[PDB]
Design a protein around this nucleic acid. Structure first.
Lengths: 157, 129, 205, 226, 123
RNA sequence: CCCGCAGAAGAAGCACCGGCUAACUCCGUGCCAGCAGCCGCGGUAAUACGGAGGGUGCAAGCGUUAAUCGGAAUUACUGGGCGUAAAGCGCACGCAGGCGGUUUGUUAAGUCAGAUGUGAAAUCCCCGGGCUCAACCUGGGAACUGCAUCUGAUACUGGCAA
């Protein structure tokens, strides 16, 4: 019902007087498969504690995204910290063909077929914040019809 | 030094939608009242009023449906440094067809969807999404 | 060309049964499926994001018996062909002649039905076809020539295929030993256990 | 396959007629459960247990049966899970709001009686407070460390603990049970047609569930993270 | 930027330089192999790398590494030269194809014997 | 091409297995011998060298080398930048070049639409057909993103007049 997914674990350091003291950061996205996504970063002294922090942080941070038939409504860009993301609806593109750290958040979002290309930097944290900014940026024909044109037969045509 | 008044119109629409202003005003012209007339026909903008005799000024009431603005993005396509003309069957659809592209054709200034059933193309002025 | 090695070690690498043996008995509990594919078999690995796609492709190729060059030509044909790509790909794999002989029940396995097709025994549209990669068109009739008719193995394998799920896109008679390929199967018609977007995505990489 | 335990079939004549998909009338006027259909349902159950226990969910094991009493405690404390085997209290799940402070009486009383006033008042008071602990201990001992509502209910006899099933169908807990021939597979989500009254069977089914639980809680993903 | 500047001067294509200047657009070249010798590698590695100097058939005199474990090359030794540097010696940009003309195969190899030119141990 | 005879008989290698990258253990050696596409391994318990077992990929091929494009948004027209990361002339004037406020009229050059001619055939793509299937051959079309001419449209751009 939740269908969690771990993307990438990084090993960081702190460098105190004694020696370099290591800890681990996780990065997860969770979400049902109807356009709800939460990413949780999370960091702890040990790996499964870190992914567990990332689960509990991801579950209370979800974003509602409106998608029809498991794909986008329109091609949408996205930008966060030098990670530019272009993702495209691909009506039966037949494959969630995105890069690393974007394929995860997309298929736990519930899109099944996009054409997603990640420009700029490819840091997994910044590209997953970029794709969640793009997915929240995308709106629906009932959204743009309810604010413009006042008919989905007029807005779509 | 003001070499594209159409881009100077669209940057007032965009800066008004950013700055949360009720109305905006630019020095009027025939093309600005035509494009603003198209935007009122579409529903991104209500109530343009041209108000002047010798030095005309046209004002626009800027729409805000939610707390969020209505003009989500607005680009300028046929800038004077690089004019862009399209065929009939090469006219774009902005935001997968739920935005409108303003094109100037020989039957007047209209939208892309209007120019498809009109069966002709021209100078795509802007992309209003 | 074809694999011809220990044909259940493949099913232990895949974990899931591939139906590569006849099924007189069950999965024998004399191969130790689902616990070891080799020496380091009890060591269960991580099997990362490339690994799940690769094991999906190796799963479908090892079910149907198709190699990588020919299978990639099947992907390319499924990509030029209209509609859903994975559905077109499984339609092309369900349209091979040895698979159609298998799903009539004229051979117990894919290699056996491939040997009946290979040994000039299987007849389609009243004509002999020697080739396991024949694409059977809709509304065709697949038969058995009089030489290899009633020789122990259509009897044995057709006796054994009575419990095997009865694929409903083809008519079969079993006394005349003929079957009409009625229509191509939809994705909903084959078992929902293979996962097509991993393969289409793998070659899309 | 009758693998190691003998789970062939049951009683004689008072079968629930809803279990017509699982019958073979033997010569001794005794039903034979369809063992070639039992195994797909049991694997469909274990595929759910790996999912909801790899959720880090809590399984509650239920079976009394006078013979499967110790197999649940032994075959469930091997995991990190919780059990009810002696007496099924009416409303331990849907009236858990008032079963809660009885658990507080048990934990808060063995806290007082392992070191505290277990001798300080009366020999008769030790004979009262200790007898209270052995009354609540095989009534709430397995559910003591739970502290919440469970995510699953593994019932070994639907006909014997049918009120635990309806109990966890007032609220939304997916129950699943190994049913007998006379049991009713209605509230049970993932029905397992088999043997309820064999010590071999309640070793086998409950043992394979015990393997899917502790083998199911990721020891691999965590390791990778580390 | 500035499309008008792109009209005045077009956007220049980057110019790729080859890593193997001994004859370009040729997979192999053949040399005379004067002075087979040894060289110590650069700093973090430490060994004796067996490397021969080679005067090719086009006038170039390049230097090239000799792979495998032991060889049989002495000073006239007409050998065949393929590409690929070593990243361990300064300037060694080529390899000698083992088992080709005189640069024979390696003894007692069993794994990866397409490389090093070793035939299948039948009998 | 078809029919018959004989008997599983004549027919499986190549690369890899530290990460990227699917696939791991032992033994031999000891910063040596060697490996390596980039990080880099090798100092006595090397999943990285050599051998064996086991496994993984491809298969009458397999791997290496050379070469082109991709990935490379890493010459960015689509599609990048320029305070400190590479990058704003030391500052101006200024010819050619580029760009140009606003209204009306005319023109139709740019622009748009149609039509005709042409854009060879083969090749790519679609729907078929024939080789036992496929590769291959082939029917019909689409396309050949164009150029020229005639006919119109005149919103924008340009030319002319006020």
């Amino acid at each position: 019902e939740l269908q969690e997914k771990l993307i990438a674990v990084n090993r960081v350091s702190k460098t105190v007087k004694g020696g370099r003291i290591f800890s681990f950061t996780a990065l997860t996205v969770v979400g049902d498969g109807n356009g709800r996504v939460g990413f949780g970063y999370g960091k702890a002294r040990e790996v499964p504690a870190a992914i567990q922090k990332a689960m509990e942080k991801a579950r209370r941070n979800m974003i509602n995204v409106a998608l029809n038939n498991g794909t986008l409504q329109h091609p949408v860009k996205g930008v966060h910290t030098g990670s530019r993301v272009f993702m495209q609806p691909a009506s039966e593109g037949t494959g969630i063909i995105a890069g690393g750290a974007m394929r995860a958040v997309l298929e736990v979002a519930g899109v099944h077929n996009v054409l997603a290309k990640a420009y700029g930097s490819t840091n997994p944290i910044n590209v997953v914040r970029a794709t969640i900014d793009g997915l929240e940026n995308m709106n629906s024909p009932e959204m743009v019809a309810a604010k413009r044109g006042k008919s989905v037969e007029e807005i779509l045509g | 030094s003001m070499q594209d008044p159409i881009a100077d119109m669209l940057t007032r629409i965009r800066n008004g939608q950013a700055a949360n202003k009720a109305a905006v005003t630019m020095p009027s012209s025939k093309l600005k009242v035509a494009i603003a007339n198209v935007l009122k026909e579409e529903g991104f903008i209500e109530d343009f009023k041209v108000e002047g005799d010798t030095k005309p000024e046209l004002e626009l009431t800027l729409k805000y449906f939610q707390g969020k603005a209505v003009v989500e993005s607005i680009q300028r396509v046929s800038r004077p440094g690089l004019r862009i003309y399209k065929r009939k069957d090469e006219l774009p659809k902005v935001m997968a067809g739920l935005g409108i592209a303003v094109v100037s054709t020989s039957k007047g200034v209209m939208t892309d969807r209007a120019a498809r059933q009109a069966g002709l193309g021209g100078e795509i002025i802007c992309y209003v999404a | 060309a074809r694999y011809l090695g220990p044909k259940l070690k493949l099913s232990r690498r895949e974990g899931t049964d591939l139906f590569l043996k006849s099924g007189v008995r069950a999965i024998d509990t004399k191969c130790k499926i689902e616990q070891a594919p080799g020496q380091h078999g009890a060591r269960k690995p991580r099997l990362s994001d490339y690994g799940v796609q690769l094991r999906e492709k190796q799963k479908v190729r090892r079910i149907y018996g198709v190699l990588e060059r020919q299978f990639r030509n099947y992907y390319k044909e499924a990509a030029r062909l209209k509609g859903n790509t994975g559905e077109n790909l499984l339609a092309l794999l369900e349209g091979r002649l040895d698979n159609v002989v298998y799903r009539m029940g004229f051979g117990a396995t894919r290699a056996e039905a491939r040997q009946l097709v290979s040994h000039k025994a299987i007849m389609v549209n009243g004509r002999v076809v020697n080739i396991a990669s024949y694409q059977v068109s809709p509304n065709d009739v697949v038969s058995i020539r009089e030489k290899a008719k009633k020789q122990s193995r259509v009897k044995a394998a057709l006796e054994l295929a009575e419990q095997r799920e009865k694929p409903t896109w083809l008519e079969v008679d079993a006394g005349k030993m003929e079957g009409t390929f009625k229509r191509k199967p939809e994705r909903s018609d084959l078992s929902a256990d293979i996962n097509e977007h991993l393969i289409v995505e793998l070659y899309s990489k | 396959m009758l693998k190691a335990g003998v789970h062939f079939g049951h009683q004689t004549r008072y079968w629930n007629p809803k279990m017509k998909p699982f019958i073979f009338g033997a010569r001794n006027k005794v039903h034979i459960i369809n063992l070639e259909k039992t195994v797909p349902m049991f694997n469909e159950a274990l595929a759910e247990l790996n999912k909801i226990a790899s959720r880090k969910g809590k399984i509650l094991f239920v079976g009394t049966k006078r013979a499967a009493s110790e197999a649940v405690k032994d075959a469930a404390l091997s995991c990190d899970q919780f059990f009810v085997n002696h007496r099924w209290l009416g409303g331990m799940l849907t009236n858990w709001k008032t079963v809660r402070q009885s658990i507080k009486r048990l934990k808060d009383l063995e806290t007082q009686s392992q070191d505290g006033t277990f001798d300080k008042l009366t020999k008769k008071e030790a004979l009262m407070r200790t007898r209270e602990l052995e009354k609540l201990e095989n009534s709430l001992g397995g559910i003591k460390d739970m502290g919440g509502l469970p995510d699953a209910l593994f019932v070994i006899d639907a006909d014997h603990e049918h009120i635990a099933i309806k109990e966890a169908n007032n609220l939304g807990i997916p129950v699943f049970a190994i049913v007998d021939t006379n049991s009713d597979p209605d509230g049970v989500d993932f029905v397992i047609p088999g043997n309820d009254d064999a010590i071999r069977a309640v070793t086998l089914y409950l043992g394979a569930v015990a393997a899917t639980v502790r083998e199911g809680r990721s020891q691999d993903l965590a390791s990778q993270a580390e | 930027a500035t499309v008008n500047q792109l009209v005045r001067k077009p956007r220049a294509r980057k110019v790729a330089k080859s890593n193997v200047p001994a004859l370009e657009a040729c997979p192999q070249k053949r040399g005379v192999c004067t002075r087979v010798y040894t060289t110590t590698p650069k700093k973090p590695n430490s060994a004796l790398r067996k490397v021969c100097r080679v005067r090719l058939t086009n006038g170039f005199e390049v230097t090239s590494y000799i792979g495998g474990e032991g060889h049989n090359l002495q000073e006239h030794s007409v050998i065949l030269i393929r590409g690929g540097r070593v990243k361990d010696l300064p300037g060694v940009r080529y390899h000698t194809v083992r088992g080709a003309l005189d640069c024979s195969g390696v003894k007692d190899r069993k794994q990866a014997r397409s490389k090093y030119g070793v035939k299948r141990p039948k009998a």
